[PDB]
C-alpha cells in the first residue's frame, strides 16, 4: 500500500477509481493521454487469466 | 518667417506640402548664410538662426510657444492628419526637442488610427522625410571633430584642462574599485562640462549620437585597469589617455586585450541553434480564434506573483481580476499591484481547441493577427538567448541562460511543478537574464509543452483544474506519435 502511494498525490484522487486505472495503464503505455484505455484493457486481460 | 501658424488649418489645407517645402527651404538657406559661433564657456555665444527663433502655434484655439524648427518637425510628423483630414487634438502634441518621445507619439498614432496599413504607410513616409531633412541639416549646419576642439575648451575651462591632463595618485592604497570610481567621477564631469559649454561637441553629447562613455574617457582622460588573457585584472593600471600617449608597459597590456578579443571571437563561432527548430515545430500550428470569451473559471485562470516591477511590464495589454470586480485590463504603470498575486486569463488555459481567445491572448490579438502567433513567440525568445550567450562569453551572468533552457528542454522542473509555478519561474529566469518578452509569448510556449493527461480540450470551463502533465519540448514532439 505504501509503495502504491507515492508522496506526490492528493487525498481527493485516492477515492477516485479512474486515477488508479490510469496509474495501472501508465506502466504499460508511456503516454499520459491514452493511459486510461490501456488500464481498462489490461483489466480485461487480467480477468481472462483464470 | 511668419509669427503665427495655425496647425489644423495648414494640416487640413491642400497647401500642406508647399508650406513645409518653403519652411524647409528657408531653414537650410539661413544655415548656409551664417556661421555658428562658439565661446567655449558657460556664457554661450549669440547666433541668429531661424530654427532657434520662436513662433506661435495655434492648436484648436490654444497658442503654444514653439521654435521654427519644432514647427517644421511637427508638420512632417503630422502628415497623418493631412492624409486622413482629421484634426490633431492637443492630447497628441509632445515635446519636439526630446527625440525619445517621438517613438511614443508614433505609438499613439498607431492606436488612434487603428493599427491600419494606411497609418503604417504614413509613419514610414514620416520616418523617410524626417531622415532626408536630417541630411540637409547635417550638410548645411555641419558637424566636425578635432583635438583643437578639446584644446579650445580647456584653455577657458580649467576643469577640462585638469581632466584632460589628469593622472592617478600613485598611492599603493588605491584599488580596482577606487580607480573605477575616479573614472566615473571625472567622466561624468567631462560630459557635464561638454553639455554646459559652447563647444563643437555639445550637440554630440546632448543628442547621444556617436558617443560611448568608456571609450570617450579613455581618449580624453584615462584608460584604467585592464584584464589579462584569462580575466584577472592586471595589478598595474594605465595612467594615461590615448591622446597623451601610452607607456611601453601599457602597450603590452593593450595588446593582451586585443589578442584576447581575437581569441574570444574564434571561440564565439559556436552556434548550435538546436532549440530554435524545436520551439518552432510545436508553436507553428497554434492559431487564434475570433471569439471574445472562451469560458474559463477564475481558479483555472493563471495566478502570477508581481514581485518586481519587471513582472507587471510583461503582462501589459492583458486582463486582470480587480478586487472589487473582475476582468479589467492591468495597468502596468500602477505600482499598486506590486506584491500581489493576481489572476490572469492565460493562453495556456483557453478552452477552445481551435485557438486562443481574445481575453486570454491579450489586446495584441488585432495587432499580431496577420502573423503567426507561435512563430512570433519563438523568435522573441530565441534572438535574445542566442545573442546573450555570445555576449556573455566576452565578460553567474551565463547561468540564467542555462536554467531557461533546462526549464523547457529538460524534465528537471517540469515533472514536479505546476504551470502556475512554471510560468512564474520563467518570468524570474527572463528577468535575471535581461530578456524582455511579454509573458503571453512565453505562456504560449508553455501551453504547447503542456499536454493534458485528461485529453479533453474543452474541459477548462469546469471549475476543477484539468488533469495534465507538462512535457519537455523534444518529448512533447515525440508524444504525438
Ligand atoms: Zn482562453
Nearest to B337 by CA among B361, B321, B325: B321
Residues B457, B448: Cα–Cα separation, whole Å: 12
Distance B102 CA to ligand 1 centre (A): 35
The answer to whether B363 is a known ligand-binding residue is no
Contact, B374 vs B340, CB < 8 A? no
Q: Residue A9 corresponds to which cell in the numbers above?
A: 498525490
Residues B200, B73: Cα–Cα separation, whole Å: 24
Upper half-sphere CA count for residue B437 (Cβ side, 13 Å) = 26
The answer to whether B231 is a known ligand-binding residue is no
The beta strand positions in B9-141, using DSSP E, are 54-59, 62-67
Q: Rounded to the nearest 5 degrees, what angle is found at the Cα of A36, between the Cα atoms of A35 and A37?
A: 95
Query: What is the nearest CA distance from A41 to chain B, expressed in angstroms?
Result: 17
Q: Tell me which residue has cell 546632448.
A: B206
Count Cβ atoms below 10 Å from residue B100 Cβ, excluding itself: 9
Residues A22, B22: Cα–Cα separation, whole Å: 80
Alpha helices in B300-352 (DSSP H): 309-313
CB-based burial label for A6 (10 Å; 0-12, 13-18, 19+): exposed
Residues B128, B124: Cα–Cα separation, whole Å: 6
Q: Structure solved using which method?
A: X-ray
In CATH, the architecture of B147-268 is Orthogonal Bundle (1.10)
> Cβ separation of A8 and B416 shorter than 8 Å?
yes
Q: Rounded to the nearest 5 degrees, what angle is found at the Cα of B292, between the Cα atoms of B289 and B298?
A: 110
Residues A14, A1: Cα–Cα separation, whole Å: 12
Give how far Cα B70 sits from Cα of B34, B64, B95, B139, Å.
20, 11, 9, 19
A32 touches B: beta carbon within 8 Å: yes
The answer to whether B291 is a known ligand-binding residue is no
B481 touches A: beta carbon within 8 Å: yes
Residues B105, B94: Cα–Cα separation, whole Å: 7
Chain pair A-B, CB pairs under 8 angstroms? 14
Residue of B nearest to A36 (CA): B454
Distance B100 CA to ligand 1 centre (A): 36
Phi, psi dihedrals of residue B105, rounded to the nearest 5°? -65, -40
Amino acid at each position: 500500500l505504501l509503495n502504491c502511494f507515492n508522496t506526490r498525490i492528493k487525498i481527493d484522487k485516492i477515492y477516485e477509481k479512474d486515477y488508479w486505472v490510469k496509474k495501472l495503464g501508465g506502466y504499460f503505455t508511456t503516454n499520459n493521454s491514452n493511459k486510461q484505455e490501456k488500464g481498462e484493457g489490461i483489466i480485461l486481460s487480467f480477468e481472462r487469466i483464470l | 518667417m511668419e509669427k503665427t501658424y495655425n496647425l489644423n488649418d495648414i494640416l487640413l489645407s491642400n497647401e500642406y506640402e508647399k508650406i513645409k517645402e518653403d519652411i524647409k527651404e528657408e531653414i537650410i538657406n539661413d544655415m548656409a548664410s551664417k556661421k555658428v559661433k562658439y565661446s567655449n564657456t558657460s556664457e554661450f555665444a549669440k547666433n541668429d538662426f531661424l530654427k532657434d527663433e520662436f513662433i506661435d502655434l495655434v492648436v484648436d484655439g490654444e497658442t503654444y510657444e514653439i521654435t521654427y524648427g519644432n514647427l517644421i518637425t511637427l508638420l512632417i510628423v503630422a502628415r497623418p492628419f493631412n492624409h486622413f483630414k482629421v484634426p490633431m487634438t492637443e492630447d497628441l502634441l509632445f515635446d519636439l526637442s526630446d527625440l525619445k518621445e517621438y517613438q511614443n507619439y508614433y505609438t499613439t498614432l498607431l492606436e488612434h488610427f487603428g493599427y491600419s496599413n494606411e497609418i503604417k504607410s504614413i509613419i514610414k513616409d514620416v520616418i523617410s522625410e524626417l531622415a532626408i531633412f536630417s541630411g540637409d541639416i547635417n550638410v548645411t549646419f555641419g558637424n566636425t571633430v578635432s583635438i583643437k576642439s578639446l584644446i579650445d575648451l580647456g584653455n577657458k575651462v580649467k576643469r577640462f584642462r585638469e581632466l584632460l591632463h589628469y593622472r592617478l595618485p600613485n598611492d599603493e592604497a588605491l584599488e580596482f574599485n577606487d580607480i573605477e570610481a575616479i573614472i566615473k567621477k571625472n567622466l561624468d564631469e567631462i560630459m557635464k562640462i561638454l553639455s554646459e559649454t559652447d563647444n563643437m561637441l555639445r550637440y554630440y553629447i546632448d543628442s547621444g549620437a556617436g558617443i560611448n562613455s568608456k571609450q570617450f574617457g579613455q581618449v580624453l582622460s584615462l584608460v584604467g585597469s585592464k584584464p589579462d588573457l584569462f580575466g584577472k585584472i592586471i595589478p598595474y593600471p594605465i595612467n594615461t589617455s590615448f591622446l597623451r600617449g601610452l607607456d611601453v608597459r601599457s602597450f603590452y597590456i593593450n595588446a593582451l586585450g586585443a589578442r584576447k578579443a581575437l581569441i574570444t571571437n574564434y571561440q564565439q563561432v559556436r552556434n548550435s541553434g538546436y532549440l530554435t527548430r524545436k520551439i518552432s515545430m510545436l508553436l507553428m500550428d497554434t492559431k487564434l480564434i475570433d471569439l471574445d470569451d472562451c469560458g474559463s473559471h477564475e481558479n483555472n485562470y493563471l495566478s502570477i506573483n508581481v514581485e518586481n516591477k519587471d513582472v507587471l511590464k510583461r503582462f501589459s495589454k492583458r486582463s486582470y481580476l480587480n478586487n472589487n470586480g473582475e476582468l479589467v485590463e492591468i495597468d502596468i504603470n500602477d505600482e499598486s499591484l506590486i506584491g500581489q498575486v493576481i489572476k490572469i486569463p492565460s493562453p495556456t488555459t483557453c478552452a477552445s481547441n481551435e485557438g486562443v481567445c481574445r481575453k486570454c491572448y491579450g489586446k495584441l490579438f488585432d495587432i499580431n493577427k496577420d502573423l503567426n502567433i507561435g512563430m512570433i513567440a519563438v523568435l522573441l525568445l530565441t534572438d535574445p538567448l542566442t545573442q546573450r550567450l555570445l555576449s556573455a562569453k566576452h565578460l553567474e551572468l551565463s547561468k540564467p541562460l542555462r536554467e531557461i533552457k533546462d526549464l523547457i528542454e529538460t524534465n528537471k522542473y517540469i515533472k514536479d511543478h505546476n504551470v502556475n509555478e512554471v510560468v512564474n519561474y520563467f518570468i524570474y529566469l527572463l528577468n535575471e537574464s535581461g530578456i524582455n518578452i511579454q509573458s503571453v509569448h512565453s505562456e504560449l510556449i508553455i501551453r504547447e509543452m503542456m499536454k493534458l493527461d485528461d485529453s479533453d480540450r474543452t474541459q477548462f470551463k469546469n471549475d476543477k483544474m484539468p488533469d495534465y502533465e507538462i512535457f519537455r519540448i523534444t518529448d512533447a514532439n515525440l508524444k504525438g506519435d
